[PDB]
Amino acid sequence: EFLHAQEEVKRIQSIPLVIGQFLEAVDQNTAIVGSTTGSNYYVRILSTIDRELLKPNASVALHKHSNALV
Amino acid sequence: PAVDTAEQVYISSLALLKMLKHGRAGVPMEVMGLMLGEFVDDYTVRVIDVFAMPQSGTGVSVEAVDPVFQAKMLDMLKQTGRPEMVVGWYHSHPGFGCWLSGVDINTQQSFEALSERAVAVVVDPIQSVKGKVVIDAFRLINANMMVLGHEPRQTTSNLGHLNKPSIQALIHGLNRHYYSITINYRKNELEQKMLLNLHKKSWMEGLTLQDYSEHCKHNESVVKEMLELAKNYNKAVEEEDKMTPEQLAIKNVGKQDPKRHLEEHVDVLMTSNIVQCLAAMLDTVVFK
Amino acid sequence: IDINDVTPNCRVALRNDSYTLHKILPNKVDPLVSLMMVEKVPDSTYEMIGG
Amino acid sequence: AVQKVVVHPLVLLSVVDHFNRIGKVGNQKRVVGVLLGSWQKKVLDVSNSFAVPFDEDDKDDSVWFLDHDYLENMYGMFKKVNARERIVGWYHTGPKLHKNDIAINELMKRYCPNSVLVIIDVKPKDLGLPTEAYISVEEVHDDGTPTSKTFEHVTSEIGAEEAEEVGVEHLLRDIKDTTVGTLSQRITNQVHGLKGLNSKLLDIRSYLEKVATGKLPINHQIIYQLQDVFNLLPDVSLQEFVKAFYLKTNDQMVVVYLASLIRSVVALHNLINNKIANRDAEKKEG
Numbered sequence: 128e129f130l131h132a133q134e135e136v137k138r139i140q141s142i143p144l145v146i147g148q149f150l151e152a153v154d155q156n157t158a159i160v161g162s163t164t165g166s167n168y169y170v171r172i173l174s175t176i177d178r179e180l181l182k183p184n185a186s187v188a189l190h191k192h193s194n195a196l197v
Numbered sequence: 198p199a200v201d202t203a204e205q206v207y208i209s210s211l212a213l214l215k216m217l218k219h220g221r222a223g224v225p226m227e228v229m230g231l232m233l234g235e236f237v238d239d240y241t242v243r244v245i246d247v248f249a250m251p252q253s254g255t256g257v258s259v260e261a262v263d264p265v266f267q268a269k270m271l272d273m274l275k276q277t278g279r280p281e282m283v284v285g286w287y288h289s290h291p292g293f294g295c296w297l298s299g300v301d302i303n304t305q306q307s308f309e310a311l312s313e314r315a316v317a318v319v320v321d322p323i324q325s326v327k328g329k330v331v332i333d334a335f336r337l338i339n340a341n342m343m344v345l346g347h348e349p350r351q352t353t354s355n356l357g358h359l360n361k362p363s364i365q366a367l368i369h370g371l372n373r374h375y376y377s378i379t380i381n382y383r384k385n386e387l388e389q390k391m392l393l394n395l396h397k398k399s400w401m402e403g404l405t406l407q408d409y410s411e412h413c414k415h416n417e418s419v420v421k422e423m424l425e426l427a428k429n430y431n432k433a434v435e436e437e438d439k440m441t442p443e444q445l446a447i448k449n450v451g452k453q454d455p456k457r458h459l460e461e462h463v464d465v466l467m468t469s470n471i472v473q474c475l476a477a478m479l480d481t482v483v484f485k
Numbered sequence: 486i487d488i489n490d491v492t493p494n495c496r497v498a499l500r501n502d503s504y505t506l507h508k509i510l511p512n513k514v515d516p517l518v519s520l521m522m523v524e525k526v527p528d529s530t531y532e533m534i535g536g
Numbered sequence: 537a538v539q540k541v542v543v544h545p546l547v548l549l550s551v552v553d554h555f556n557r558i559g560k561v562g563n564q565k566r567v568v569g570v571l572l573g574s575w576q577k578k579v580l581d582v583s584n585s586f587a588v589p590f591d592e593d594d595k596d597d598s599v600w601f602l603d604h605d606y607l608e609n610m611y612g613m614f615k616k617v618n619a620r621e622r623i624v625g626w627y628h629t630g631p632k633l634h635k636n637d638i639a640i641n642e643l644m645k646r647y648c649p650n651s652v653l654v655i656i657d658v659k660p661k662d663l664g665l666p667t668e669a670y671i672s673v674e675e676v677h678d679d680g681t682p683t684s685k686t687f688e689h690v691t692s693e694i695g696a697e698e699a700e701e702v703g704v705e706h707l708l709r710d711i712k713d714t715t716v717g718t719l720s721q722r723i724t725n726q727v728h729g730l731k732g733l734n735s736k737l738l739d740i741r742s743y744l745e746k747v748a749t750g751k752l753p754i755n756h757q758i759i760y761q762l763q764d765v766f767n768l769l770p771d772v773s774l775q776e777f778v779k780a781f782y783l784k785t786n787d788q789m790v791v792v793y794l795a796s797l798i799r800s801v802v803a804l805h806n807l808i809n810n811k812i813a814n815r816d817a818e819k820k821e822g
Contacts, residue, residue, distance in 0.1 A: 130716055130718065131714055133716070134714070134715050134716070135327075135328065138327050138328070139327075141326070150516075151511060153508075153511060159510070169498040169510065178451060183516075183519065183520075192323075192324065192326075209553075210549050210703075210707055211546070211549045211550060213703050213706070213707070214545060214549060214699075214700055214703040214704075217699035217700065217702060217703045218546060218697070218700060219617075220699065221697070221698060221699035222618055245553075246553070249618075251616040251617055266613065266616070269609065269613070270613060273606060273613075276606065277554070277558075277587035277589060278561060278587070279557060279587075322699060325699075325702050326698070327705075328705050328709060329706075330703065330706040364502045364503075368502060368503070382706070382707065384707050386660070387552050387556075387660060388549055388552050389707065390660035391545075391549065391552055391658075391666055392548070392707055392708055393708060393711070393712075394665060395695075395696050395701070397665070398725060398728075399732070400663070400729035400730075400732025400733055400736075401729065402729070403722075403726045403727075403728055403729030404726065404729040404730070404733065413787070416788070416791050420794065423794075423798070427798070434805065456802060459798075460798060460799055460802050463795040463798045463799050463802075466791055466792075467792055467795040467796070467799075468717060468718070468719045469717075470788045470789075470791055470795075471719060471792065472717065472719065472722040472726070474785060474788050474789075475723070475726060477781070477784075477785070479726060479730065480770070481770075481772050481781070483730065483733060484770045485769045485770050485772050485773075
């Protein structure tokens with residue numbers, strides 16, 4: 128089951144992701160991402176990501192449907 | 198009388214695949230088709246086959262059911278051996294989730310006119326992009342009984358409240374004008390031993406020794422990164438800061454040095470090396 | 486969330502479906518004014534200043 | 537020609553469903569249907585297949601009725617539903633070819649010049665794919681032998697598209713092995729490959745026995761393909777190869793030893809931590 132869960136987490140990042148700008152991190156497990164579509168969103172950060180890479184304004188790929196940063 | 202929340206729309210393995218394929222063909226538009234199955238009893242609606250109806254400018258509406266096409270399709274499928282009745286209809290909701298709009302409700306009522314149990318199915322080919330298959334079965338709630346009685350479905354069992362309504366379906370009219378039906382997937386062996394062949398892995402793949410060049414490169418890279426990680430583990434353990442160590446282990450949790458990037462790599466290396474060596478020896482024995 | 490905690494210009498977050506507020510979120514700061522806040526302290530110390 | 541045939545999962549479930557429904561009411565050996573698919577450069581991609589009424593007499597082997605009008609009407613319906621699919625061949629669930637398959641192949645060629653017969657067995661066999669795409673070849677045989685219609689073979693593989701893949705993943709989420717090379721699955725796969733090699737060698741040996749006893753003809757072709765196989769044997773125990781392979785085995789074993797040392801040290805550290813935690817809890821108890 129753990130292996131299947133890992134595969135699911137990896138499948139969350141599945142290519143067709145909308146690029147967005149990381150605006151500011153509200154707190155771990157969440158952050159504000161400004162989607163390139165032209166609307167600011169509040170999304171849920173993925174745990175596996177590296178917190179160091181989350182610069183004040185960096186390009187973050189967002190899930191196309193759920194809009195969670197992945 | 199009343200419909201039990203225990204009713205279960207049985208969707209066969211072929212039906213789900215055909216519905217997904219038809220929905221994915223139409224996107225960016227909306228496809229629709231009639232569902233062939235049996236009303237086996239009051240608490241179950243079994244769908245065996247689903248045949249797409251041709252795309253028409255009308256859309257998914259009562260006029261999308263070309264009577265000549267449906268009649269000829271049923272007549273020709275009867276000869277092959279599928280004398281099934283029309284148990285319901287399905288239409289793809291690209292983008293938006295499984296719910297029913299006004300025209301959808303009108304079409305559902307028209308279908309119900311023929312049979313009181315004509316279930317309606319909604320499939321979204323875009324949401325169902327991964328191990329999740331967003332498929333819902335909906336039927337119309339007599340707005341009359343909304344006041345004449347109360348809710349529309351008896352709850353004689355717990356086989357239905359083991360599921361949850363969706364904000365989307367709730368917003369578009371769920372439990373108000375439309376009520377969902379638990380979708381059970383009727384899968385059997387032969388139809389599950391044939392589908393474990395999409396990726397079955399040939400016997401050869403389990404005797405290929407990889408390539409020793411990139412195998413050595415991978416071993417070297419993993420060993421170097423594990424040396425760096427061992428340096429980090431050394432720093433973390435030798436520190437052993439006792440300023441509330443239970444709190445220290447929780448204030449430095451970031452999926453880092455200690456064990457995560459640790460023995461995870463040990464497992465990767467040892468699995469790869471053991472498998473490669475065993476395959477090499479099996480080849481040295483089997484092939485001469 | 487209590488209505489008393491939503492002060493004007495608080496940068497709330499709204500649910501996509503019904504647009505209900507479910508968080509307060511940090512107040513918006515103009516991007517360019519954020520860089521002016523000293524997050525990493527400089528290395529200079531008083532003993533380094535002489536005379 | 538056809539370099540390869542990709543049979544999408546729906547074709548298989550359709551052919552399992554047709555065989556089941558025909559078998560459930562009445563009894564009929566084999567099940568014949570028309571395969572619909574699109575042509576890549578040379579890789580035929582079968583996506584859908586519809587049943588066609590088909591009565592045959594096993595005794596005569598030359599009596600067989602296949603609907604022409606029914607086939608054309610079904611194809612017209614499917615073209616209305618989706619026109620990207622053109623007829624590309626036929627399938628029959630019969631595990632082995634049949635003497636009348638050539639006439640049916642000609643009838644199919646009447647609708648598609650490049651017809652591929654995919655024999656979709658409905659009996660789960662753990663060793664091998666469930667498809668075998670066949671084509672009709674008329675040649676002069678070169679090697680002074682009588683020529684006949686026969687059935688040339690084309691490689692077959694089962695692929696899928698996004699929708700069919702999602703459906704398959706949902707269907708087999710309870711009997712699916714975890715994706716990732718867990719050592720258990722790797723060792724099991726290696727065992728499976730050994731079993732497949734044994735089965736293939738047994739089949740080859742049975743054919744060789746038949747040829748030697750005369751029950752089957754000496755091909756004069758393909759046989760020398762087996763000879764080439766026997767020439768391509770690794771020839772292990774050569775001194776240079778032995779030294780190189782020992783070097784590689786030791787190079788892998790040193791990494792395995794380092795991994796074992798890391799694992800032992802981590803386990804010992806965890807044991808120390810747990811022991812200290814237990815002792816601290818006991819001391820704080822009183």
